[PDB]
Design a protein around this ligand. Structure first.
Ligand code: HEM
Ligand SMILES: [Ca+2]
Ligand SMILES: [Ca+2]
Length: 306
């Protein structure tokens, strides 16, 4: 069983070291908090939160960093290396990379103005990476609501609240033009933009992402508060201003009978959202963890111990 007090004796200063690292990095890179939260999400959705995503290539297995959902998208790996080194210095061979990334995600959320809570700990590090599993398990922005629900249920999160609350991670961070080009100019081969995208916002997005333009250009997930972790993400959905297809579907999909009330509830109350986010975050962080003597306490998050 994972417990929040796992390192209270072996490394009581772990959370503080992680926090300090993120604060320092945020000065030069204001996007790092969002990036780190996403790393934890992509870790947990592939064989569980076992730091498998942090492993680099080996001749026996490919890195998950080359998965379609990670390649030229996932970022912040050096920052994780930095805090790991700092933690290793303070508490040698004690904190697993899986736990380190979980704490980093929570601290990132709190630093961005979100809720503060102690995450369950005790996770251990994987002995391999899973590229094929990452390609199969990570959801895509073009997924329909039924597909989004399928993706979450596939890894163990059955509740619509899990999906709606965790999607709130898009209250900050960036998104490449490539992922919304269809919504802007030719959605589902209709030759027309996605009708669920507010027409005024459509104009703004087309200006940021012109046809035949730089597909790698970045746009903010939350037009209201781009870098602040708050419930504004849901207010946007209510106005048909969700950035990617998977965001807006939570409110506009024909299959959204169960998700619409959740979107409204979170848009109406920061407290309701924050409570649900913490609840969902801990549930995601409890996905098939290696514990006890299973796996290792990786010393270098990029490679398995030898
Ligand atoms: C429900 C399905 C989800 C889909 C399809 C999805 C899709 C995406 C896409 C397309 C990007 C843009 C990547 C890029 O342009 O490089 C992204 C970024 C991001 N996602 Fe999601 N996401 C989902 C769920 C989540 C969840 C559960 C969290 C965390 C709780 C999360 C947190 C983030 C963050 C913070 C970013 C910004 C990262 C950065 O700016 O570096 N996402 N997501
Ligand atoms: Ca993993
Ligand atoms: Ca926000």
């Amino acid at each position: 069983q994972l417990t929040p007090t796992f390192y209270d004796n072996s490394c009581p200063n772990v959370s503080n070291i992680v926090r300090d690292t993120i604060v320092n990095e945020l000065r030069s890179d204001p996007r790092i908090a969002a990036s780190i939260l996403r790393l934890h999400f992509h870790d947990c959705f592939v064989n569980g939160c076992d730091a498998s995503i942090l492993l680099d290539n080996t001749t026996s297995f490919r890195t998950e960093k080359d998965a379609f959902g990670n390649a030229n998208s996932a970022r912040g790996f050096p920052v994780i290396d930095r805090m790991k080194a700092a933690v290793e210095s303070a508490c040698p061979r004690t904190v697993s990379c899986a736990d380190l990334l979980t704490i980093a995600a929570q601290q990132s959320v709190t630093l961005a103005g979100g809720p503060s809570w102690r995450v369950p700990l005790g996770r251990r590090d994987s002995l391999q990476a899973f590229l094929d599993l990452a390609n199969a398990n990570l959801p895509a922005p073009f997924f329909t609501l039924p597909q989004l629900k399928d993706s979450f249920r596939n890894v163990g999160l059955n509740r619509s609240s899990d999906l709606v609350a965790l999607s709130g991670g898009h209250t900050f961070g960036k998104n490449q033009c490539r992922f919304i080009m269809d919504r802007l100019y030719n959605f589902s081969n209709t030759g027309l933009p996605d009708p669920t995208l507010n027409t005024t916002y459509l104009q703004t997005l087309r200006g940021l992402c012109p046809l035949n333009g730089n597909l790698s250009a970045l746009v903010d997930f939350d037009l209201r508060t781009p870098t602040i972790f708050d419930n504004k993400y849901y207010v946007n959905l209510e106005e048909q201003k969700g950035l990617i297809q998977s965001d807006q579907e939570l409110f506009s999909s024909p299959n959204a009978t169960d998700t619409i009330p959740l979107v409204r509830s979170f848009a109406n109350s920061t407290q309701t959202f924050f409570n649900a986010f913490v609840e969902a975050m801990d549930r995601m962080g409890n996905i098939t963890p290696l514990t006890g003597t299973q796996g290792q306490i990786r010393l270098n998050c990029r490679v398995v111990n030898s």
